[PDB]
Amino acid sequence: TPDIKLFGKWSTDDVQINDISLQDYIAVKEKYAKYLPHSAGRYAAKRFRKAQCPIVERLTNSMMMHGRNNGKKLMTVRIVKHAFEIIHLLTGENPLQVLVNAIINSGPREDSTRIGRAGTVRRQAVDVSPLRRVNQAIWLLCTGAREAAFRNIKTIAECLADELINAAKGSSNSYAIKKKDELERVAKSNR
Amino acid sequence: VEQKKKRTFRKFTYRGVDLDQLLDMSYEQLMQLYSARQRRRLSRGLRRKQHSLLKRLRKAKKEAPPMEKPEVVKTHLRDMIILPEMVGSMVGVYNGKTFNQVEIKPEMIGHYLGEFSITYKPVKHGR
C-alpha cells in the first residue's frame, strides 16, 4: 500500500490504452489506482462523468445484471477479483491490461442507425463515438460471459476470464468479438 | 343389537379402542383419545349445550320399533362433533335451506356434522 497504490494487488502504472481516441474513457489511473472495484460513486448526475469511473469498476457494475443480481456488487467485486487472478494465471501480464485490451478491441468502430428511409426503411452507416465504444464493449463482454456461464458448470469468473482473454487478443472465439464484427459489418453495407 | 352375532357384524375400532369399549365410556374418555379438533370443540363448547339434542337422540332411539331406523332428530348445529354416544342415530343436518337426513356410522367418529350435509351445488359450465 504505501509504495505504490496497487490493485487488489495489481499495478496501475505501466498499463497503456493501446488505442488512440479510446484513451481516456478507459479510466485506469493517469493516476487513479485504487484498491477495490467498489466506490460510493456518483457518476449519474452529469452526462460525461461516467468516464471518470475506473473501467474496472465499470466492468464490475455491468456484471451485476439480471433482475436477481441487481445490487449485488459485493458479488461482482468478488467475481472481478477472481477473474483478474485467472487471467493472470493464463498469461501473466496485467489482467487489468488484459481487461483494457478486450475493451479496446470490442467497441464497434462503425455502426448502423435505423434511418427513416420511406417505406422500406433502410439503415445508415454512421461512425460511433468513443463513449459508446467503451459502453458497448463492456456490455458485450459481460453479456458474453453471463450468457455462456448460465447452463455450464463453469463460473462467471472463469467465463469472464475466457471472454476477456479471447478478446484481449481478438480470438473471435468470443461472443463479444463476433457480435462487434456483426454490428460493424452491418454498418458498412447500408452505406 | 344384543346377543351372539345378532345384528352386530359391522365392527369398527376407533383409536385402537373397540366400539364395544367405545360405546362404554364417558364422552370424556373418548375425546381423550385422539380427534384433537373435535375434543377442543366439545371442551370449549362445554358448559356444553347440545344437551337437549342428545336427549332428543336417545328419546327417538327408544321409540323406534325394535328393528331398523325410525324417525330422526333435526338440528342446525353443524359444528357438533360426532362421538360414540351418537352412533346409530339419524340426524337432520341443515345446510341453509334443507335438512339432509343422515345415519351416523361409527366411522364418522371425530368428524363434524357439517361434513355430511353438502351446502353448495356442484355447479355447471356446459349444460
Binding site: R78, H82, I86, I153, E158 | -
Partner: protein, 75 residues
C-alpha cells in the same frame, strides 16, 4: 441439447486417467474435470481435494464458491 451423464464412482482406469492427465491442464476446476473426463462433479470435488494431496495441482484461490487450480509447479 446439452445432456450430461456422469461416471459417479472410481474405475481404476479412470483413477489412472486422473493422475496421468490433470498435470496436463493449466486450469482445473470442478467443470474441467467434469467435461474432460465424465466425472460426477461430486466425484470431481473429491478428486480436487485429493489432488491437492501434496499436489499434482496448486491452489491459487478456493473461494468458497471456487477452487481455481493451476498446473503442478514445473519448468
Amino acid at each position: 441439447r446439452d445432456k450430461l451423464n456422469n461416471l459417479v464412482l472410481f474405475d481404476k482406469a479412470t483413477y489412472d486417467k486422473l493422475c496421468k492427465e490433470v498435470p496436463n491442464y493449466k486450469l482445473i476446476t470442478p467443470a474441467v474435470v467434469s467435461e474432460r473426463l465424465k466425472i460426477r462433479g461430486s466425484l470431481a470435488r473429491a478428486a480436487l481435494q485429493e489432488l491437492l494431496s501434496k499436489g499434482l495441482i496448486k491452489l491459487v484461490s478456493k473461494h468458497r464458491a471456487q477452487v481455481i487450480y493451476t498446473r503442478n509447479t514445473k519448468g
